[PDB]
Amino acid sequence: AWPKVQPEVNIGVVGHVAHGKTTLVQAITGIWTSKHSEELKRGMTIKLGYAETNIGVCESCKKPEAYVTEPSCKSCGSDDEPKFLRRISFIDAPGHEVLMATMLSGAALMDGAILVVAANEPFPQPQTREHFVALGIIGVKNLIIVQNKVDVVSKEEALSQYRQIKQFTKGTWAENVPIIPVSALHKINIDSLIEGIEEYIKTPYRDLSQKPVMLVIRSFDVNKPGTQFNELKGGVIGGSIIQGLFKVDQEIKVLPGLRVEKQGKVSYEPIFTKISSIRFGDEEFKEAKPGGLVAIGTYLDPSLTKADNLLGSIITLADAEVPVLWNIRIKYNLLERVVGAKEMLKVDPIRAKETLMLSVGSSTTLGIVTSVKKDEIEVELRRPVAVWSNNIRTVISRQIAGRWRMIGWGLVEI
Ligand SMILES: Nc1nc2c(ncn2[C@@H]2O[C@H](COP(=O)(O)OP(=O)(O)OP(=O)(O)O)[C@@H](O)[C@H]2O)c(=O)[nH]1
Ligand SMILES: Nc1nc2c(ncn2[C@@H]2O[C@H](COP(=O)(O)OP(=O)(O)O)[C@@H](O)[C@H]2O)c(=O)[nH]1
Ligand SMILES: [Mg+2]
């Protein structure tokens, strides 16, 4: 048998709308990540999708078919049990141009990524470009490019596109990244991709002694109809542990916390609670480390967590000191052009009084520019952000032609 362990690595899946991200994750894991009504009706990803799988290798078989996602080697002709390698998970991003902020919140959780490129569409499409640039900015450099939908193009067309992809990465940080051709729909060459994931998206080093920090991307009321009462539960908070570890019965706090009134003004009150349970997928654990998206059970009133109310928050230990800032100073750089537009325009300099969109960790916040200097801006935010370390990456977006567009990035200076 294989052990039951949490995923140890997060692999982002990014790329232009409908190029096959969610179908690729299904091909690898058997899971369709879309769970929301509007996602199922529109046939598109809207919220961040998630799925897990074990990975193993049949030591008596040849690669790539030796790589498997279940404890069997029957498919490559061996009665031996495959050797367990690791459990992995996928952060399945929306590709739609209006949902770039959601992709960015997911990229803060990624240990590596797969950029999916449809073989039957012109290259490079706007969000092929935009997600590629975003990965570079955020520093997700452990990248595999997957050429999907090769089932509906000729060998000649696929090779032509392959050469344009290599030329696109030429002279960039991604110059050496592998391109793996597959069909997600018909599950062709998926074993080569799994081998690729093992070779190019290794589990990163973690620091388990750093102050525990979880970036929140989901929060739920897990109580369903037709249940007794001795099986009802407090609110659940879901996200990615980016450093340290958490344990059942630990006293924790949610930051910035709850929007409340205090002394005639709007305030954020840190939410203190205790960890009641820890789950990854369908399995319970006594502790949680980086890797995977964890569900943290709490003793909170489920009305506090219902419907992703805490999205963008962080969780730390109760006694941790974490800055919560209404005003932030950013050492910034601007992109040369608006890469996500169908027509790439030049990026205008930042001006005082502009309303910008800031991506910080899993949070997305609007703010007004109160100060512009050559490489430093100061922003008055509409909501405070939790800033758990010095020099956290932020991505800057501006509304251009009715759309939020990524235009730059920087470090939040504390
Ligand atoms: N022929 C062919 N069609 C595919 C393949 N992979 C995905 N598709 C089809 O492409 C369409 C979009 O697939 P999705 O997996 O939903 O693409 P997506 O990238 O997740 O789309 P968004 O999340 O909305 O940005 C669906 O109709 C799929 O069945 C493939 O390998 N070959
Ligand atoms: N820690 C913890 N997590 C839970 C518990 N029950 C459910 N979860 C997790 O919370 C998430 C939401 O649960 P689910 O029943 O699917 O709620 P739904 O998505 O609204 O239908 C899932 O990913 C579960 O793994 C629990 O008792 N403790
Ligand atoms: Mg999708």
Numbering used by the authors: 2 to 415
What does the publication say?
In eukaryotic and archaeal cells, the initiator tRNA carrier is the e/aIF2 heterotrimer. In its GTP-bound form, this factor specifically binds Met-tRNAiMet and brings it to the initiation complex. The γ subunit forms the core of the heterotrimer and contains the GTP-binding pocket. α and β are bound to γ but do not interact together. We were able to observe GTP hydrolysis by aIF2 or by its isolated γ subunit.
